[PDB]
Design a protein around this ligand. Structure first.
Ligand SMILES: NCCc1ccc(S(N)(=O)=O)cc1
Ligand SMILES: NCCc1ccc(S(N)(=O)=O)cc1
Ligand SMILES: NCCc1ccc(S(N)(=O)=O)cc1
Ligand SMILES: [Zn+2]
Length: 257
């Protein structure tokens, strides 16, 4: 019964998920002056041409676009990663207002939203095993700012009426996640966690420097979703973001100078 309200939001999660106060929690503030350029980092390899999207779900905290991860169809490699990571789902976090919504921050700047493309390390066989491992997941984070529309986001926007409330799902085949990427794949990377319970410390974070632009109309539709189930008092799905956590004994590395 965790969520994002006053009574069950991020400040409460530690009572059921004590790892909330752990040593490698996410998100974090990215201090761009402190992040060290690491020339040993590789270019990211994003191989999404054969992606197979299947369904979109309102899970009560966000909406997830789910993929067929039973073969190496949509994978992330290179960068800081050893081995092959398969795309399982993407989702977003966003605000009630354009001046907040991202989970990571940059020099304390909050973006209007953040996209997370979630991948699991194939050496562990399944997502549920991978989350038990320190190198089990790689999450590609992409900031959203409000300006011009993102054409590749519009299919997502237009299906949201069909999944307004918690527990609703809809067919969502033939979606190309390449349409959500910025032009540049320059990134920061650091070891961290899931940003929702169970907050497991299993993620290599790869946060792209270049934000994507979406329109005010696009993000407005996100904010008309509901946390609640059908027939229950309406609770708009907004401010479903965890704030920055202590960096502790971690280094953020930059792929670029
Ligand atoms: N729903 C109110 C009671 C309640 C509040 C907080 C949590 S936690 N620690 O999981 O965030 C569970 C239950
Ligand atoms: N093989 C696992 C398939 C799969 C399971 C769950 C989800 S989600 N995004 O709703 O957590 C997506 C894909
Ligand atoms: N719901 C599946 C588990 C889970 C997957 C990804 C994330 S995040 N926000 O860190 O990309 C949190 C939890
Ligand atoms: Zn997320």
């Amino acid at each position: 019964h965790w969520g994002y309200g006053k009574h069950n939001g991020p400040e409460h999660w530690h009572k059921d998920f004590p790892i909330a106060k752990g040593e490698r929690q996410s998100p974090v503030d990215i201090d761009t002056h402190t992040a060290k350029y690491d020339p040993s980092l590789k270019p990211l390899s994003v191989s999404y041409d054969q992606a197979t999207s299947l369904r979109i779900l309102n899970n009560g905290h966000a909406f997830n676009v789910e993929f067929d991860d039973s073969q190496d169809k949509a994978v992330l490699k290179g960068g800081p990663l050893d081995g092959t990571y398969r795309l399982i789902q993407f989702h977003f976090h966003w605000g009630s207002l354009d001046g907040q919504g991202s989970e990571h921050t940059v020099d304390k700047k909050k973006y209007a939203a953040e996209l997370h493309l979630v991948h699991w390390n194939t050496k562990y066989g399944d997502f549920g095993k991978a989350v038990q491992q320190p190198d089990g997941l790689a999450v590609l984070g992409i900031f959203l700012k409000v300006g011009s529309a993102k054409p590749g986001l519009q299919k997502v926007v237009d299906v949201l009426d069909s999944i307004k409330t918690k527990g609703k799902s809809a067919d969502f085949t033939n979606f190309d996640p390449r349409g959500l990427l910025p032009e540049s794949l320059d990134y920061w990377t650091y070891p961290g966690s899931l940003t929702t319970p169970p907050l497991l410390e299993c993620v290599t974070w790869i946060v792209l420097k270049e934000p994507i632009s979406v329109s005010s109309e696009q993000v407005l539709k996100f904010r008309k979703l509901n946390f609640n189930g059908e027939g229950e008092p309406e609770e708009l799905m907004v401010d479903n973001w965890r704030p920055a956590q202590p960096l502790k004994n971690r280094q953020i590395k930059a792929s670029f100078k």
